[PDB]
Structures are given as C-alpha cells and as structure tokens.
Amino acid sequence: SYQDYINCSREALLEKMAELLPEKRLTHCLGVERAAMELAQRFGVDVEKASLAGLLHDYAKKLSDQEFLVLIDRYQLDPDLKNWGNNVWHGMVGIYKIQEDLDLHDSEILRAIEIHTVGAGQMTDLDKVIYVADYIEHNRAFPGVDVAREIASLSLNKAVAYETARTVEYLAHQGFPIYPQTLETYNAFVHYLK
Amino acid sequence: SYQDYINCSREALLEKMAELLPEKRLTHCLGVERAAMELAQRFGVDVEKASLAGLLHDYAKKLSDQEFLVLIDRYQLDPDLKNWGNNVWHGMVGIYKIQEDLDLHDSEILRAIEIHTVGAGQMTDLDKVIYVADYIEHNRAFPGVDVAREIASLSLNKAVAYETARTVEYLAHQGFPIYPQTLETYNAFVHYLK
Numbered sequence: 001s002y003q004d005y006i007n008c009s010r011e012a013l014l015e016k017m018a019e020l021l022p023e024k025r026l027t028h029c030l031g032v033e034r035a036a037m038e039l040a041q042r043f044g045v046d047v048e049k050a051s052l053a054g055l056l057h058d059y060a061k062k063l064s065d066q067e068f069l070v071l072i073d074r075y076q077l078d079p080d081l082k083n084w085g086n087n088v089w090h091g092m093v094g095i096y097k098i099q100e101d102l103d104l105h106d107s108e109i110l111r112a113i114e115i116h117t118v119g120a121g122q123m124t125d126l127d128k129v130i131y132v133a134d135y136i137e138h139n140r141a142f143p144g145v146d147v148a149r150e151i152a153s154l155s156l157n158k159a160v161a162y163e164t165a166r167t168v169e170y171l172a173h174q175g176f177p178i179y180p181q182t183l184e185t186y187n188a189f190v191h192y193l194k
Numbered sequence: 195s196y197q198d199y200i201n202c203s204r205e206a207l208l209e210k211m212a213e214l215l216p217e218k219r220l221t222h223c224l225g226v227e228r229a230a231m232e233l234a235q236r237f238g239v240d241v242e243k244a245s246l247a248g249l250l251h252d253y254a255k256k257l258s259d260q261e262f263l264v265l266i267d268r269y270q271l272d273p274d275l276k277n278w279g280n281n282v283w284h285g286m287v288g289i290y291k292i293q294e295d296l297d298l299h300d301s302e303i304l305r306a307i308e309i310h311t312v313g314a315g316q317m318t319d320l321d322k323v324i325y326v327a328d329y330i331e332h333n334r335a336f337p338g339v340d341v342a343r344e345i346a347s348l349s350l351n352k353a354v355a356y357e358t359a360r361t362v363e364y365l366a367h368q369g370f371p372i373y374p375q376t377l378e379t380y381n382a383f384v385h386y387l388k
C-alpha cells in the first residue's frame with residue numbers, strides 16, 4: 001500500500017493533492033500513475049514504487065517561487081538553482097516539500113521524482129519509467145505523442161532518448177535556457193535513437 | 195598585411211590552402227574572410243584580424259582523425275576531446291596545426307578560430323564576428339540564412355544567439371551529440387533573442 005512509503009492512504013493523498021493542484025494537473029498525475037504502472041510491468045520495475053512516484057511527480061508544481069527559494073536555502077541546495085525556475089524546481093527542489101508533507105524517505109522514489117523533468121546521465125529504471133510516463137500518459141495530446149507511445153512499447157532507453165531529444169529541440173526552438181543536466185541526459189541517451 | 199601574423203603572404207596562403215582543402219571549402223573560407231571583414235567594420239573589430247581569422251577558420255577541416263588524436267596527445271589537451279570528432283576538433287584542436295604550419299601566435303586570432311564551431315559562454319567581439327561570419331557568408335544557402343543575415347546587420351549578440359539556438363535545435367532534431375561548450379554558449383546568449 002502507499003502507506004508503506006507515505007504517512008497517509010492513497011485516498012487521503014488524492015484529497016490533499018486536489019487542494020494543492022488544479023483539476024487538469026491532478027488528472028495528469030493520475031495519468032502518470034497509470035502509465036508508470038504499465039511501463040514498470042513492461043520493464044521490470046516495482047509497480048508500486050512506479051505508481052506512487054508517478055502520482056507524486058508533479059505534487060509541488062504550484063509552489064511559489066519564494067517557497068522554492070526558501071527550500072533551496074533551508075536544504076543548502078546547489079546555489080545555481082536560484083538562477084532557474086518552476087520547471088527545474090518542482091522536481092529538483094519539490095522533493096523536499098513532498099518529504100516534509102508526506103514523510104516520504106524512500107531514496108528510489110525521491111530520486112525518480114527529483115529528476116523527472118531534467119533526467120540524469122545515469123538513471124535507474126524507476127527514474128526512466130517516471131520520466132517516460134510523464135510524457136506518454138493518456139491525457140497528453142501533443143504532435144508526436146503517438147511516436148513516443150510506440151517507442152515506449154518497445155524500449156525504455158529509446159523512449160528516454162526520444163523524449164530528451166524532442167525536449168532539447170523544443171527548448172531551442174522556443175529560445176528557452178536548457179538546464180545543463182538536461183544535456184547530460186541528452187548526450188548519455190542519444191545513441192539509443194539508432 | 196597577413197605576414198604581420200603568419201609566415202607567408204595572403205597569395206602564398208591561398209596556394210597552400212588550395213592543396214589542403216576541396217574547392218568548395220576554400221570558396222567558403224574566402225566567403226568567411228569577406229563576411230568577417232564586413233562584420234568587423236560594423237561592430238568595431240580589427241578588420242585585418244577578422245579577415246585573417248575568417249580565411250583560416252576551416253584550415254584544418256580535412257585533417258584525419260588520427261592527426262587530431264596525435265595533436266590532443268602532443269599538446270596534452272582535454273582528454274575528453276577524444277570522445278568527439280572533426281566538428282569539435284577542426285577548430286578546438288586544429289589551431290595547433292595552423293600554429294605549426296603558419297607560425298600563427300596571435301592569441302586573439304587563435305581563440306576566434308578555436309571556438310568558431312562551439313562558441314563559449316564568454317566571447318570576444320572578434321570571436322563573435324568569426325562565429326557569425328561562418329554562418330552568413332555569401333556562399334551559404336540554407337533555409338533561414340536570410341534571417342541570420344538580417345539579424346547580423348543589426349546586432350552581433352543577437353546573431354550569435356540566433357545561430358546557436360538554430361544549431362542546438364538542428365543537432366537535437368538530427369539526433370547528434372551536443373558538445374557541452376555549445377550549450378554554455380547557448381545559455382549565455384539566448385537572452386538576446388528577446
């Protein structure tokens with residue numbers, strides 16, 4: 001059960017998340033919970049850890065900038081984090097809020113949430129499951145999501161590679177800064193595209 | 195004159211480069227020489243240093259992999275360079291071959307050639323001139339070169355930003371590894387797009 005990892009039931013968690021997040025965002029989290037379960041089954045990851053990490057991954061999406069800056073100071077995190085924003089923070093810093101609120105201490109689940117946006121050069125299978133689940137969950141509708149879904153049916157690594165390449169491509173297309181850890185992920189996984 | 199910086203005349207250099215490079219590549223170098231002169235005039239860079247760096251920038255384009263690996267060892271360069279290829283090497287390592295052949299010691303010209311492919315987070319105006327000249331020289335015909343040319347008529351910094359964004363976008367589109375220094379350039383300049 002979820003209570004093996006957090007301080008409340010799944011039902012209790014959903015009630016709490018419904019207060020924290022817009023409807024569309026909670027719907028997304030429920031989508032990631034489901035997609036993570038399917039991917040974990042496929043690729044030999046604990047379905048329960050995948051499901052919970054999937055539900056929780058965007059728990060901190062709506063924290064204010066000030067709250068994130070407070071957490072960076074309190075946990076004495078990488079000071080460079082102050083140069084970024086919500087997209088980097090909600091996973092990389094938001095894990096601390098999740099830990100405070102839910103008493104989540106499982107290192108594997110925390111790490112999967114931590115890097116769900118930016119990845120890392122080295123990712124566990126759980127990390128990859130959450131990273132991909134976020135991109136392919138059934139509520140998502142962006143051009144090319146069909147390709148991501150097909151790839152994810154065959155190869156977890158190629159799915160990470162594809163998603164990361166598309167993210168880097170889109171950020172450069174839009175003229176947004178690219179977090180350096182994102183490139184670390186990109187360069188580590190891009191060989192899987194062939 | 196060019197002989198103020200190298201061990202031969204411009205005419206002598208062109209004869210030497212004609213033996214080293216395919217016709218199309220030498221034509222390109224002549225295009226960069228010209229574009230660098232125009233940009234340097236516009237943005238307050240020594241036109242002579244810009245012209246020479248422009249002509250020389252791709253001097254080492256046709257060195258073999260083995261020759262580059264030999265130079266990395268001989269000059270005890272960043273060992274990570276062995277994980278890359280011609281695109282990174284011809285500037286970053288090729289400067290040593292240029293120095294050997296032509297007795298080029300001017301630090302400014304060498305640096306501009308060194309980073310003409312990947313840029314850096316900190317670039318001199320000469321560095322930016324060569325970086326942009328390479329992209330907009332009159333022989334180039336790629337979709338969007340007209341936009342690059344317009345931007346370069348107004349802002350050197352925005353031209354660097356635009357070129358770097360398009361390069362990162364294209365590398366990710368194609369599924370090629372992105373040299374980390376390229377991202378350093380991207381993140382440093384992307385603010386100029388606005």
Ligand SMILES: [Fe+3]
Pocket residue numbers: 057058090091116117
């Ligand atoms: Fe997220």
Ligand SMILES: [Fe+3]
Pocket residue numbers: 028032057058134
């Ligand atoms: Fe998400």
Ligand SMILES: [Fe+3]
Pocket residue numbers: 251252284285310311
């Ligand atoms: Fe070049």
Ligand SMILES: [Fe+3]
Pocket residue numbers: 222226251252328
């Ligand atoms: Fe060139």
